């Protein structure tokens, strides 16, 4: 059984085994190396791999990671301090607001909607009711801070400097007088001074022309009666007038009343009592009063 | 003599002078060499001269050769949560009310005093003031009732005279004016019969007043007390058919009793006479109110 | 024959002794049956699978990008949602009258306690307040009305009327009701007998004493104060005699002046006669009264 060449021991090998000069070696890629005389795994640097516990193992932070079914797994305890902080905000916070409350979602700012006329914010940031002036109508008015009665309604004085005219059955004449005027509540008082006139008739008219002669702030319209231009027998009274023709006057008791106001002219009736022939009349001071027009 | 190799220990084996090596999965032939086999891409790689693990350097780092999370992984999440915690609303104090389950903030208000207008604003509820006559609503404000300031009426009734056994009656038509707290009865001129030195004139307001004025509306604020109010002088023409002699008498309001107003007429002397001519006279006095 | 002879030496990790070859192995390499194997003690994420050495990871938490271990972005989805949810609408700051305490996370509101309060029901409410009123406007049985005292007050004067004229001086004790109604005062003198009078003269009412409480002297001052006026001018008939039948003269009376609590009335006109005694009619004196 003679083959020319007799192989003895080992004459060949398969990769990664190789033979050079009758010496056998093993080729090694990166990752495999020699540690002393033994084949070793090479783990350059520090990347989480290490030779420990008898072999190749992967290392990880035992607070952040764990192994479940031989799978790298996040420990749930690494998220917990996040979930409890959020959960602590979810348990109670404001997401929406109802009027008068207003939340601007984009600025995260909360404010309150109020009404200027009724409410105001003071110098302390407090919400407060605005101190409002109540709606009043003369003669009701603001009096030193409160709801009162206007002093101008209670009393007002002025003067009329003007013409008194007598008319009656052809008898004719006029005189100039200065008179105080007092307006008190809903009345006007015209305080005529004593004056001298001429012939009067049994019945006649004494007219006061308020179209001119009223001193500011009074105007003609302020002498209009509350009964306006109706014909009345208002404030009828008895006046004594001295009649004469140069000599000793005879005092006649006459009847006088406010009868009508028309277009600024107050007309007073003067009648009754006796009559005599005479050329002169000595009139007494006479106050004439009546209720005054208002608006 | 033999110097060769005749047997080998695993993982080496020999058949017919040829040696081979047995390899499990994970070890493999790469070109001529033994190599670690790493199928797919699972983070493992042969690099920098050996076996290494590969990790996103934004999320992980290595500390004492352990895989570790970068702290900067959570920086965004911790900053955001901190951005809320540092200042937010978790609770509300009345009248502010927070429902924790719906995250709704609303305000508790009193429906009688406050309200929310169409503008969605908080505004004080308008309240009409409580007013007592003669204070009243005048064209929308607190004013003085026009009716208290001036009221016109009329009396058509009997005036009667009584003095020292002289008696007689007359009918008159008189305007009445009520102005603030006074009443004025404007009697017209009238004729009568004989009068005494002193006597009483009576106005019977029980009948004759124009609706809606009533008898009680003529009651003095001094009610039925006896007074000497509004004393004045009046001239009365006394005659017996001829030319009258005018006597100056003294007249005042003396008492109202049950709708009848009494005026005293006395003084000024006396003559013998059968007829009297009375002037127009206005009678005024403070009027009753409740 | 000519023999091949073969291998006679070897390099680590192979070694030869007495015709036997062995291979030295360090930790991490081990025998698995007759094969060479990677040793992986325990479970640390490493495994032999799919043909070789692989690393294993939770596929919900990690992924492989560029062959680098990486965090799935879906790991942070539950958290990014909740945070965002709060972010899109929450209260960070409050404006007066609202006040947020950034530390206690407590929101309240600042109110003025003089005009506003919190009731029993926890509601916000305006405090009920009485309107501010000025006499003669007053609280009348619950509402805003006209004070009854201003509408009618009654009192009395018990004192001396004095006449003065052309060297004539005399005085007379009288009593009179006083009525104050709205802005007027009325003094109701009774008829009385006096003595000689002149053509013109002054009748004076001394209000310094004799007014009944709660009326005071000052209460009789006219709204025109101490101005000299011709107010309430009227006719009065006065009987003049020397003990016999009086002759009645028509005189002119009016309010002339009030001064230091004494009211003066002018009385003039209508002629005259020699006489020693005067019979005065009842006279009511009225004028607008002073107010504060
Ligand atoms: C993390 C990683 O890269 N994994 C690789 C893996 C790894 O490199 C080795 O296991 C380490 O030793 O190799 C895997 O197979 C690859 C092929 O994709 C190797 O064979 C590798 O790449 C080459 O593969 C050739 C290709 O040239 C040719 O196109 O296709 C044939 C098959 O048809 C071969 O696969 C390559 O891409 O060129 C040749 C190269 O020399 C090889 N490297 C080594 C070190 O031998 C694997 O193990 O499955 C693929 C895996 O993704
Ligand atoms: C990630 C992992 O699985 N690690 C394993 C590890 C790993 O598979 C190898 O290192 C990779 O080559 O192997 C570890 O040891 C085990 C046994 O503890 C291996 O020997 C492995 O186990 C098997 O179980 C055998 C039984 O078949 C036998 O009857 O009894 C023995 C002693 O109890 C074992 O139980 C198995 O899983 O089937 C046999 C199997 O063939 C073995 N695998 C290989 C590749 O030879 C280790 O290294 O310690 C365990 C470690 O968890």
Residue numbers in the entry:
A (entry chain B): 161 to 455
B (entry chain A): 166 to 455
C (entry chain C): 164 to 455
Please quote the paper that reports this structure.
At the virion five-fold symmetry axes, the trimeric attachment protein, σ1, extends from pentameric turrets formed by the λ2 protein. Reovirus attachment is thought to proceed via a two-step adhesion-strengthening mechanism, in which σ1 first engages widely distributed carbohydrate receptors with lower affinity. To enhance an understanding of mechanisms by which viral attachment proteins engage cell-surface glycans, we determined the crystal structure of T3D σ1 in complex with α-2,3-sialyllactose, α-2,6-sialyllactose, and α-2,8-disiallylactose. The structure of σ1 residues 170 to 455 reveals a highly elongated, symmetric trimer that measures about 200 Å in length.
We therefore determined crystal structures of σ1 in complex with α-2,6-sialyllactose and α-2,8-disialyllactose. In each case, only two of the binding sites are occupied, as the third is partially blocked by crystal contacts. The electron density for the α-2,8-disialyllactose complex did not allow us to model the terminal glucose. Comparison of these structures with each other and with the α-2,3-sialyllactose complex shows that the terminal sialic acid is bound in the same conformation and with identical contacts in all three cases. Inspection of the α-2,8-disialyllactose complex shows that the N-acetyl group of the second sialic acid forms a hydrogen bond to the side chain of Ser195. The complex with α-2,8-disialyllactose identified a hydrogen bond between the N-acetyl group of the second sialic acid and the side chain of Ser195. However, the results from mutagenesis experiments demonstrate that a Ser195A mutation has no effect on either HA capacity or viral growth. Therefore, the observed contact is unlikely to have physiologic relevance.
